[PDB]
Amino acid sequence: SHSMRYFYTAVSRPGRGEPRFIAVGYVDDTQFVQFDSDAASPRGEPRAPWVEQEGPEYWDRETQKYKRQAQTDRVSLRNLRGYYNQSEAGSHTLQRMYGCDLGPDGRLLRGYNQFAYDGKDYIALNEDLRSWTAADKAAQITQRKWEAAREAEQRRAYLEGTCVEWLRRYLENGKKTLQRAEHPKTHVTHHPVSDHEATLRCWALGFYPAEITLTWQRDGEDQTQDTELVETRPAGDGTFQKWAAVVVPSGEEQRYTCHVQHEGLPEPLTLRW
């Protein structure tokens, strides 16, 4: 399953100019575009090699879409402050995520279009891409405006087709790096803690895509509750890193195994110290 996803953030700052607008776009876990209204020269910028070749006409068109979206987001921020009867001095945040999912066969499996206000769910296109789910009474104002305006049908028209067409084109242009899976490079380290406890840490480095499962077992039984897991983190070269730790009784290290599951592995890995 592949996907193309867009992430928009608008932040007000009363007394210090107009709201700032930031957009980024991903294919799977690979970023390919960014826009920042506060940039020195605000324009759509490439973040991936398979869009560097698209031509100035394409990049002029993406730049214009972001500049128009930024101005609409400013209006939305002003409307939202009114809905909630909020002071004109406070700074507020509007976020939007939308995109499409190209199911394993290569069709259009799923689309989505969701908004949050000040870090909380506000309004969202439901899975059928026809109805809306509003979080409160202020979001019901937006739902009434968009249903009478037939907003959902326009977004569906994009998520179906247009979103899918760009996605398929991007996967063909960047096939060398988007349709590959790099397996994790693994190892286990050992740290004494006390005169009777020690930490075992299972490492996964350089893998892609970001999805992965690391689980510590004892005598073959999983131990989800006593396993410390860090959030998967970017290495900076397009790949990801993760680790998982468990504190074990000294003398019993050989009873523990780390199990690694990832798309690039033919079989799940079993590691021991």
């Binding site: 867009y6 957009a23 987001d73 939305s76 977004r155 994009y158």
Partner: peptide
């Protein structure tokens, strides 16, 4: 290819 602005602001 990003989506164009819709029918209305929020």
């Amino acid at each position: 290819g990003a989506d164009g602005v819709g029918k209305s602001a929020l």
